Amino acid sequence: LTPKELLPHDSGQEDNERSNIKSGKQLKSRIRKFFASLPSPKNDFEILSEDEKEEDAEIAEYEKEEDNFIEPPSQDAPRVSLVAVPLAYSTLKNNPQSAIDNKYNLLVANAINKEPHMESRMQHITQGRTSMKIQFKTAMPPTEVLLESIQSKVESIEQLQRKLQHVQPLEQQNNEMC
Amino acid sequence: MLCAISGKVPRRPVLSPKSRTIFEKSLLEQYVKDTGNDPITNEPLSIEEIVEIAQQASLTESIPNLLTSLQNEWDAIMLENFKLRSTLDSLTKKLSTVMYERDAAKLVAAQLLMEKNEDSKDLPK
Amino acid sequence: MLCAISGKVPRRPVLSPKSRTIFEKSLLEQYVKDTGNDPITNEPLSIEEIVESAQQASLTESIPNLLTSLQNEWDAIMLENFKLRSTLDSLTKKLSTVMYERDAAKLVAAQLLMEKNEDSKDLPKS
Amino acid sequence: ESAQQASLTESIPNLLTSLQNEWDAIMLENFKLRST
Amino acid sequence: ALYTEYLKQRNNKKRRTPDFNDDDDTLFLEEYRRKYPRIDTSRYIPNESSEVSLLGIV
């Protein structure tokens, strides 16, 4: 028994296994793909599900870290979450059609709320004022960096365009005299 | 009748062979020059794969009004494009709020089954 | 601007009427005196077939190029809608399955709060 | 059976200012040409 | 008629005119300004990528 550069490969593999369990069992939505902290909205939404809405609001404030972070004693989850997902899947052509009908009702509700809009008007002009601040300053930087280089060669373009209108006027009086 | 990229009535339509879809020659070429793929089924397709496949002229009305008509239609299309983008970002945002509460509820089910397991031990004693 | 045979800047351009391509006169004449052909497509072409009015023209600058410009504006904006429409059929398909598994799990949460409270109601009375 | 036109740095104007000048210059020239 | 009168048909300069805290039709106007700025930045981004080179070859 003589290990050499094996316990260092085993400690790295044990660290690579522990990092795979912590990244996977951290959060389901945060690890996959893509909010402001608001305790006043959790207090106003208490009056909904009325028990699970307060459980999901505290789970959103804990995973994001007027904001206080309290309990990361929530997510050793990875074996209890596998049994909960397999138990919930067992309780769950006809199901595929009822989901497509509800998705068309939600798409018709999303097209109705957008049609009625086109308080909220003051936020869109302020987003435009942020856009008119950002893009037009980026435009004036891209225009003046271009106009230091293009207006020199616009004069190389336009004055040679003026040579064509005199070469054409001398061509017609010469072809007339020919 | 409709190209399934822009929805225009195609004036030089081309059909893809990897997926059954009649596209427009100009729009499908710009997609293939970006990435060598089919926009619907994401299958590997090239420009030589395309097979180049009703024309009714609009007669609008009985010229300065046609200038402001074009001005209105580009004004409407810019808003009919903008409203369909903010709708996409908010339905993805409201899908994200459902994904947190789906994973938070299956953690609340873990403590509720523990209260049922603790109760089943007490009922047996 | 270039000659297709040599690659130089032609000082006497002549265009052939069998395969349209701008050839230099002294180069293409030697090609025709070699064999009576057009060097690109190998079709028959003679010296009189190669050729070097009143409406004055102006340079191609940013009516016709303005109409072809607005084609590029809209054909690009049409692809921008497809990036949106294809992403909408992915998020709404994922929303249909997420709202379904939310509707299927909340019936189990409603029964566990019943069963864990009924078992607390049963045990404390005993 | 390529030409390059460098679009201006200040390229709204293609709808408003460029398009009016194209149909002004078409209108005034042909009328002056009928006068010619 | 336009050349004989010497008068040009007016274009819409309403997009320059728009103002904050206005009605629902002007809310359409300010969102029109946002779509025009995103298009203008995209058009300016192509010119920057091309460089003078494109003005040089013409």
In chain C, the N- to C-terminal Cα span, in Å, equals: 102
Give bridge partners of residue B60 from the DSSP assignment.
Answer: none
Q: Which of A126, A127, A135 to mutate to test the interface with E (most CBs of E within 10 A)?
A: A135
3 state DSSP class of B74: helix
D28 and chain E: CB distance < 8 Å anywhere?
yes
Q: Work out the minimum CA distance from C105 to partner chain A, whole angstroms.
A: 6
> Which helix or strand (DSSP H or E) is residue B24 part of?
strand B21-24
Q: Provide the token pair at A167.
A: 């070469």
E34 and chain B: CB distance < 8 Å anywhere?
yes
> Crossing angle of helices C64-125/B64-122, nearest 10°?
20
Cα-flanking dihedrals φ and ψ of residue B78, to 5°?
Answer: -65, -35
Cα-flanking dihedrals φ and ψ of residue C14, to 5°?
Answer: -130, 135
Query: B–E: how many Cβ contacts below 8 A?
Result: 20
Q: Provide the token pair at E12.
A: 């819409």
Option in A81, A110, A111 nearest B106 (CB): A81
CA dist B97 and B93 (Å) reads: 7
CA dist A7 and B114 (Å) reads: 39
Residue for token pair 């300065």: B64
Cα C117 to Cα B119, D4, D7: the distances in Å are: 9, 78, 74
Give the contacts of A117 (CB within 8 A, at least 6 positions apart). Answer: E27
Q: Which residue of chain D is at minimal alpha-carbon distance from E11?
A: D16
E28 and chain B: CB distance < 8 Å anywhere?
yes
- CA C62 to chain CA mean position, Å: 22
Cα-flanking dihedrals φ and ψ of residue B32, to 5°?
Answer: -70, -35
CA dist E52 and A148 (Å) reads: 10
Give the contacts of E26 (CB within 8 A, at least 6 positions apart). Answer: E18, E19
Q: Do residues B12 and B24 make contact, with C-beta atoms less than 8 angstroms apart?
A: yes
Interface of C with B (CB under 8 A): 74-82, 84, 86-88, 91-92, 94-95, 98-99, 101-102, 105-106, 108-109, 112-113, 115-116, 119-120, 122-123, 126
Give the contacts of C5 (CB within 8 A, at least 6 positions apart). Answer: C23, C24, C27, C28, C31, C39
Long-range contacts of A71-78 (CB under 8 A, 24+ apart): A74/B107, A75/A25, A75/A26, A75/A27, A75/B107, A76/A25, A77/A25, A77/B107, A77/B110, A78/A21, A78/A24, A78/A25
Q: Which residue of chain C is at minimal alpha-carbon distance from B31?
A: C79
Of A114, B82, A66, whose CA–CA distance to E35 is shortest?
B82
Domain ranges of chain C: 1-126
Query: A–C: how many Cβ contacts below 8 A?
Result: 40
- Compute the residue count for chain B: 125
> Which helix or strand (DSSP H or E) is residue B51 part of?
strand B51-52
CA dist B23 and B38 (Å) reads: 10
Give the contacts of D23 (CB within 8 A, at least 6 positions apart). Answer: B67, C63, E9
